[PDB]
Each structure stands twice: as structure tokens, then as C-alpha cells.
């Protein structure tokens with residue numbers, strides 16, 4: 001763990017980064033469906 | 049003395065050091081035994 005070490009840090013960095021962009025695409029498909037029905041909770045809850 | 053019938057030399061007598069074999073699970077040695085767990089908890093984690 002002293003030798004390689006940092007690849008687990010960037011594995012912990014990219015996956016936390018990936019959960020961030022996963023919500024941002026979820027809120028984006030709540031946004032293009034926002035011109036259909038409601039502001040968020042229509043396309044949020046149906047896709048939740 | 050007569051003329052020699054065998055040639056000599058002072059030298060050092062000592063034990064051979066034991067050549068302990070690289071036993072058949074030798075390929076696990078290049079990583080520490082916690083890193084093999086940390087890779088296993090990565091591929092059980094990142095897959096989840």
C-alpha cells in the first residue's frame with residue numbers, strides 16, 4: 001500500500017466523479033422532459 | 049622432506065547456505081497479501 005497506493009485514490013476519485021455526472025444526466029433528462037409535463041417531480045419520480 | 053606428492057592450500061571450510069525453494073504459490077509474491085484483497089475488494093466494489 002505504500003508502493004502503489006495512489007491508484008486506489010484515483011479509483012476513489014473517478015467513481016465519486018462518476019456519481020456526480022450520473023445525477024447530472026438524470027437531472028438533464030428531467031430537464032428535457034420538463035417541457036413536457038412539470039418542472040422536476042414528473043420526470044424525477046417516474047424515472048426514480 | 050622429499051619432493052611433494054600432493055599440492056595443498058589453506059582454505060576455509062563452511063556450511064552451504066540452504067537454497068529455500070520458491071514454492072508453487074510463487075507468483076503471488078510480487079504483490080503484498082493485502083493488495084490482493086484490495087484488488088478483490090475493488091472488483092467487488094467497482095462492479096457494484
Ligand SMILES: CCCCCCCC/C=C/CCCCCCCC(=O)O[C@@H](COC(=O)CCCCCCCCCCCCCCC)COP(=O)([O-])OCC[N+](C)(C)C
Pocket residue numbers: 068069070071072073076077081084085087088
Ligand atoms: C493481478 C490481477 C488481480 C487478479 C485477481 C486477484 C484478486 C483475488 C485474490 C485474493 C487473494 C489471492 C492470494 C493472496 C494471499 C495469499 C498469498 C500469500 O499471502 O502468500 C502466502 C503463501 O501462500 C501460500 O503458501 C498459501 C496461500 C495461497 C493460497 C492460494 C490462493 C489462490 C489464488 C487464486 C486467486 C483467484 C484466482 C481467480 C481470480 C478471478 C504467504 O506465505 P509466506 O510465509 O510469505 O511464504 C511461504 C514460504 N514458502 C513458499 C517458501 C513456503
Ligand SMILES: CCCCCCCC/C=C/CCCCCCCC(=O)O[C@@H](COC(=O)CCCCCCCCCCCCCCC)COP(=O)([O-])OCC[N+](C)(C)C
Pocket residue numbers: 081082085089091092093
Ligand atoms: C464493497 C467493499 C467490501 C465490503 C467488506 C467485506 C469484508 C471483507 C474484509 C476482508 C478483510 C481482510 C481479511 C483477510 C486477510 C488475509 C491476508 C493474510 O495475511 O492471510 C493469508 C491469505 O491467504 C489466503 O489463504 C487467501 C484465501 C484464498 C484466496 C482465494 C480468495 C478469492 C477466491 C477467488 C475470488 C473470485 C472473484 C470473483 C469476482 C466476481 C496470507 O497468509 P498465509 O501465510 O497464506 O496464511 C495461511 C492461512 N490458512 C492457513 C488458513 C490458509
Ligand SMILES: *[C@@H]1O[C@H](CO)[C@@H](O[C@@H]2O[C@H](CO)[C@@H](O)[C@H](O)[C@H]2NC(C)=O)[C@H](O)[C@H]1NC(C)=O
Pocket residue numbers: 064065066067068
Ligand atoms: C540452512 O541451515 C540451517 C538448517 O535449518 C538454518 O539455521 C537455523 O536457523 C534457525 C533460525 O533462523 C535456528 O533454529 C538455527 O540457527 C538453525 N537451526 C538448526 C536446527 O540448526 C538456516 O536458516 C538454513 N537457511 C539458510 C542459511 O538460508
Ligand SMILES: CC(C)CCC[C@@H](C)[C@H]1CC[C@H]2[C@@H]3CC=C4C[C@@H](O)CC[C@]4(C)[C@H]3CC[C@]12C
Pocket residue numbers: 021024025028
Ligand atoms: C456533462 C453532463 C453533466 C451533461 C452532458 C451529458 C451528455 C454526456 C449527454 C447529454 C445528452 C446526451 C445525448 C442525447 C441523445 C443522444 C442521441 C442518441 O441516438 C445517441 C446518444 C446521444 C447523442 C446522447 C449522448 C450523451 C449526451 C450528449
Ligand SMILES: CC(C)CCC[C@@H](C)[C@H]1CC[C@H]2[C@@H]3CC=C4C[C@@H](O)CC[C@]4(C)[C@H]3CC[C@]12C
Pocket residue numbers: 001005008009011012086089090093094
Ligand atoms: C473502491 C474501494 C472498495 C477500494 C478499496 C477500499 C479503499 C478505498 C481503501 C482500503 C484501504 C485504504 C488504504 C489504507 C492505508 C493507507 C495508508 C495511508 O497513509 C494513506 C491512505 C491509504 C493508502 C488507504 C487508501 C484507501 C484504501 C486503499
Ligand SMILES: O=S1(=O)NCN(C2CC2)c2ccc(F)cc21
Pocket residue numbers: 051052053054055
Ligand atoms: O613434479 S613434483 O616435484 N612431484 C609431483 N607433484 C605432484 C603430485 C602432483 C608436484 C606438484 C606440484 C609441484 F610444484 C611439483 C610437483
